[PDB]
């Protein structure tokens, strides 16, 4: 059970790292998109 | 510019599908984690 806990905690950390980068990638694209739609 | 617009929107949609799944995966693991911590 202790190893299950550890692996669960590692998976959760791995998901947090993915979410951090993807949310930054989305925010950067939303900003660029807003600029482009204003231009168009 | 029109091509940039289309690709930005496709990328944002792909990022939103990833975020939806990754957040559900994280929430499910947090739920399991609390249960495991209660067992332990």
């Amino acid at each position: 059970l202790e190893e299950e806990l550890k692996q669960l905690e590692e998976e959760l950390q791995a998901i947090e790292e993915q979410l951090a980068q993807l949310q930054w990638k989305a925010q950067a694209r939303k900003e660029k998109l807003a600029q482009l739609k204003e231009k168009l | 510019l029109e091509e940039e617009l289309k690709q930005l929107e496709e990328e944002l949609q792909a990022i939103e599908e990833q975020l939806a799944q990754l957040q559900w995966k994280a929430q499910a693991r947090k739920e399991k984690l609390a249960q495991l911590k209660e067992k332990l």
Partner: nanobody, 123 residues
Framework: QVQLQESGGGLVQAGDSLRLSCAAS????????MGWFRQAPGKEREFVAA?????YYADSVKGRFTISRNNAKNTVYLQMNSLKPEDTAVYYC???????????????????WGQGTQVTVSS
């Protein structure tokens, strides 16, 4: 087509500072993570720094090097202080154009690579 062009390398003495520049000239790069890798003699390309939601640094350069970006100019920079002979390497600018997850410290997860600039730190 799309490229990343590094400049600012050269020969330097131990203890000096140096600033590397990388101009991205393909398309917009403000939505892409950008970073630096290096290859020293007889070693593999190794992670130096990356910039996205935040700055990341290899342990070997933390507190001596700073990564920064000028989004308007489509450029990324590597500010280097307290240079040592083991910092001698070819320094490569990199970019990640993927909308999918990519690991900031894995060379294979960057799809755009500059040609590299040589930095030499004499003892």
């Amino acid at each position: 087509q799309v490229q990343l062009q590094e400049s600012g390398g050269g020969l330097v003495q131990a203890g000096d500072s140096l600033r590397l520049s990388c101009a991205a000239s393909g398309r917009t790069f403000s939505t892409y993570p950008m970073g630096w890798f290096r290859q020293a003699p007889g070693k593999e390309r190794e992670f130096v720094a990356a910039s996205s939601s935040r700055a990341y640094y290899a342990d070997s350069v933390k507190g001596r090097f700073t990564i920064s970006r000028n989004n308007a100019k489509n450029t990324v920079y590597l500010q280097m202080n307290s240079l040592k002979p083991e910092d001698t390497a070819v320094y490569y600018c990199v970019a990640d154009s993927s909308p999918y997850y990519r690991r900031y410290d894995a060379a294979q997860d960057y799809d755009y690579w500059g040609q590299g600039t040589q930095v030499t730190v004499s003892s």
